[PDB]
């Protein structure tokens, strides 16, 4: 079967620059309600190698994970876990296993009282 390459993840200290840049270019800021899971679907491009993602939050942590949907099978790429992306920007990358759709899950399920503001950015290489 297809062997799935391991994702890469890291962080960069400048949070304020990221959120500043996001608001400028477009308005895409996901507001995740209380007990909600937002899933951003990001398909693979016919000629493309990797998907790069970035995300950050304002006042609070949030759950993040990455799944891959084939061409409904699901591979788990980054298992869903809580990140402190309010302190720093969180980034990562993964190589295409094949033709399919990436599911970026922003998981607030645990939080009873608190909505989360999510700034995110996505890229791909060729």
């Amino acid at each position: 079967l297809p062997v799935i390459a391991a994702p890469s993840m890291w962080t960069r200290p400048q949070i304020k620059d990221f959120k500043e840049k996001i608001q400028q270019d477009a308005d895409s800021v996901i507001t995740v309600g209380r007990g909600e899971v937002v899933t951003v679907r990001v398909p693979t491009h016919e000629e493309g190698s990797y998907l790069f993602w970035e995300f950050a939050t304002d006042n609070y942590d949030i759950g993040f994970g990455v799944y891959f949907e084939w061409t409904p099978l699901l591979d788990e790429i980054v298992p869903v876990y809580r990140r402190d992306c309010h302190e720093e920007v969180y980034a990562g990358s993964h190589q295409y296993p094949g033709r399919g759709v990436y599911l970026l899950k922003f998981d607030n399920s645990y939080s009873l009282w608190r909505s989360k503001s999510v700034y995110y950015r996505v890229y791909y290489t060729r």
Partner: protein, 40 residues
């Protein structure tokens, strides 16, 4: 511009500057998501 090397860069040195430059050279192409789903 090999994909694997673009990754080692951004890991080690990451900023808006590197991102915009990598956008300039079309090493990284801005992505457009399709659907954004909401569940409880």
């Amino acid at each position: 511009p090999p994909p694997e090397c673009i990754n080692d860069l951004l890991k080690s040195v990451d900023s808006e500057e590197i991102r915009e430059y990598c956008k300039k050279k079309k090493w990284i192409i801005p992505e457009i998501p399709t659907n954004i789903e909401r569940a409880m």
